[PDB]
Design a protein around this nucleic acid. Sequence first.
RNA 1: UGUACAACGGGGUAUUGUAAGCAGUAGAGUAGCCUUGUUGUUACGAUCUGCUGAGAUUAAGCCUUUGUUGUCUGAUUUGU
RNA 2: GAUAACCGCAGCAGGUCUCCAAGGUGAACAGCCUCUAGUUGAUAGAAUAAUGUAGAUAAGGGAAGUCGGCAAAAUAGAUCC
RNA 3: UCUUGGUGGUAGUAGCAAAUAUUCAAAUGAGAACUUUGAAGACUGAAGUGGGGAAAGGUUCCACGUCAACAGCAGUUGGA
Lengths: 109, 48, 63, 63, 48, 136
Amino acid sequence: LKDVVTREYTINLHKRLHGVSFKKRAPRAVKEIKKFAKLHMGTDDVRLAPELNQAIWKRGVKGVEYRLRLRISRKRNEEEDAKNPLFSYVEPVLVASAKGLQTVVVEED
Amino acid sequence: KSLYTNTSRKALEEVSLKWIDTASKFGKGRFQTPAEKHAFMGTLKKDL
Amino acid sequence: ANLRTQKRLAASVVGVGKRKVWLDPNETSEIAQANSRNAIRKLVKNGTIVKKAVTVHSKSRTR
Amino acid sequence: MKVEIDSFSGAKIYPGRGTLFVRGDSKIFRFQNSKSASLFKQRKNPRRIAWTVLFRKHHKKGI
Amino acid sequence: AGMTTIVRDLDRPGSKFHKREVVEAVTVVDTPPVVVVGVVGYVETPRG
Amino acid sequence: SGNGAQGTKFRISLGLPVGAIMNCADNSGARNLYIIAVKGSGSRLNRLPAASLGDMVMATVKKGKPELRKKVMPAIVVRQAKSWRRRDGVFLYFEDNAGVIANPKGEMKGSAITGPVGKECADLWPRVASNSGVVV
RNA sequence: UGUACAACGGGGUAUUGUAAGCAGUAGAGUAGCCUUGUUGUUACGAUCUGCUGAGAUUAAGCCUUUGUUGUCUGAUUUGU
RNA sequence: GAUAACCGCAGCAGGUCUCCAAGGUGAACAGCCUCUAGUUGAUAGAAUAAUGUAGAUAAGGGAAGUCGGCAAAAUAGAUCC
RNA sequence: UCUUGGUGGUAGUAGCAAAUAUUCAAAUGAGAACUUUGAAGACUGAAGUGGGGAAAGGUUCCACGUCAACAGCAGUUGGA
Ligand SMILES: [Mg+2]
Ligand SMILES: [Mg+2]
Ligand SMILES: [Mg+2]
Ligand SMILES: [Mg+2]
Ligand SMILES: [Mg+2]
Ligand SMILES: [Mg+2]
Ligand SMILES: [Mg+2]
Ligand SMILES: [Mg+2]
Ligand SMILES: [Mg+2]
Ligand SMILES: [Mg+2]
Ligand SMILES: [Mg+2]
Ligand SMILES: [Mg+2]
Ligand SMILES: [Mg+2]
Ligand SMILES: [Mg+2]
Ligand SMILES: [Mg+2]
Ligand SMILES: [Mg+2]
Ligand SMILES: [Mg+2]
Ligand SMILES: [Mg+2]
Ligand SMILES: [Mg+2]
Ligand SMILES: [Mg+2]
Ligand SMILES: [Mg+2]
Ligand SMILES: [Mg+2]
Ligand SMILES: [Mg+2]
Ligand SMILES: [Mg+2]
Ligand SMILES: [Mg+2]
């Protein structure tokens, strides 16, 4: 199908960080966004924007939000690309609430 | 099926039930039916 | 590169701690030749190194 | 098969549910759950607990 | 499927709860019909 | 239990082991009853014999009339404070434990019971039912 | 390539206990304006009242789904 | 000038004399949180069996435990009586 | 239970679990959990994990180059 694509997603980090140790909720939230992008966009190389790492770690190591709202964009890996020719860049989306939002396809236009 | 005939008066007791609990086992549920929940609580804010 | 000596120099030049010296990441190439203290001062002139203002301890709730 | 009424919250008690309390003056109390039960032992007035049946008659909610 | 509780009268003459109600845990087993798809014949041998 | 009890009892949760001090609910002069042993107790290693409502115990008196003190006497538990289950699914309990001084056959030493009596106790012991007022 | 599965979303169920914001002639009162009410006014005021059994959370090993968006052939080995 | 520059076989949780000393809470140079300054060093990742170690909670009873209340709990500040 | 030296099994085992804690991106590089910079989260919390000194050490200070050995993982880093 189409390779370069951009969709926006909601991730329930509450059910992914359920019961995790408090010194590792926000470390694991980073590793669950990468697992979530690899499930959706199919690509093993996931690069998270530093503004998203600010959003995960906003309320400390154990204060991860229940729902993030993510703009994952599958892209073309360049400059002697890795084992996969594609990567996904994961963006925060500035919303007042991450509740009640579905998966939409963001067009580049 | 039982492997032996049992005539022990705890068997052979013809059982007619009077009520069966259908409250939510997902909590300390209080209503047998959703009609009973809507009758006790009245109308809520939830849309129509 | 290795800008560890360019942050200790810049802290002693602008006179604050190394926690309050912002080196320009996008100008990491030209910071790396600033081995002398005058070269550090030159990078403070043009904003390549920024003093990084103080973290607020507000006294408003105390008042 | 008689449905009892909670002595604190006014909820309906189906068989097996909750605890029955005999106070030392032999007045029988009946709880549907441990939320009615614990707030009874905590010396809480049902007229001030906003979800109880007695609060809603005191505040004329759902008449 | 899970358990629930019931109420029934007790028909046990000489018990103290005779003709009174009891509250009993039951287990509920969800049993659709089973499709018969074969037969197997077993012979009695000296080894079983 | 043992002899004296009229009828049998369903199994009630054992609330009162040996060493438990329970209030004394009759007008004999005893203010409490310290359970030294329980009649009808099964022999199990390390298991304290544990009294329950309607059971007959052997007890001393630690507070009360001096002529009742320093002696072992039978007593019958009338209130429990440990939540037990009835056969109709009712879980119930009292605010306190209570017992009345008995003889070995189940006659009351006292003549009046101050407070509620478990219906399992009143049914098992006719003299306790005779002197009880409200029954649960 | 399905009465498929997943991620979200919806409903149910459940827990807590009535969100934020706005409003009030509720508020112990206090300090001013007085062209001095008498259900004045300006300021400040714990709390209270209405919207509001609300709001939040709900599977992470809850249930259900006609929604939305995706996924669906990589590798190795085995023969009487 | 020491959780890596000293002594302890060594980059050892040990030991080794002293100066300066911000805001709040509070009686306090206590505990707890912050400013300046400093560090973010200590093999990591995944999973969440048993038995541990460290921390908890426990219905009813309340020392029946044990050589022995060992450990834990309980008490706790201040004002007045 | 000789002496000196060498070597095994145990065994890729026990273990590398005190001192709250790391995370994202870029740069450098053959190679980055560990380096550098930025961002973020945190801590010591002024009887400090902060600035100096005494004894002791002796060049460990600082720069450039470098990574065979040493830093009980790693290492482009280093009191090497
Ligand atoms: Mg857990
Ligand atoms: Mg349940
Ligand atoms: Mg309200
Ligand atoms: Mg409000
Ligand atoms: Mg020596
Ligand atoms: Mg070392
Ligand atoms: Mg202070
Ligand atoms: Mg003060
Ligand atoms: Mg540690
Ligand atoms: Mg206990
Ligand atoms: Mg207790
Ligand atoms: Mg003893
Ligand atoms: Mg003993
Ligand atoms: Mg002790
Ligand atoms: Mg005093
Ligand atoms: Mg030798
Ligand atoms: Mg060897
Ligand atoms: Mg090992
Ligand atoms: Mg480990
Ligand atoms: Mg601390
Ligand atoms: Mg702190
Ligand atoms: Mg160097
Ligand atoms: Mg090494
Ligand atoms: Mg190496
Ligand atoms: Mg050096």
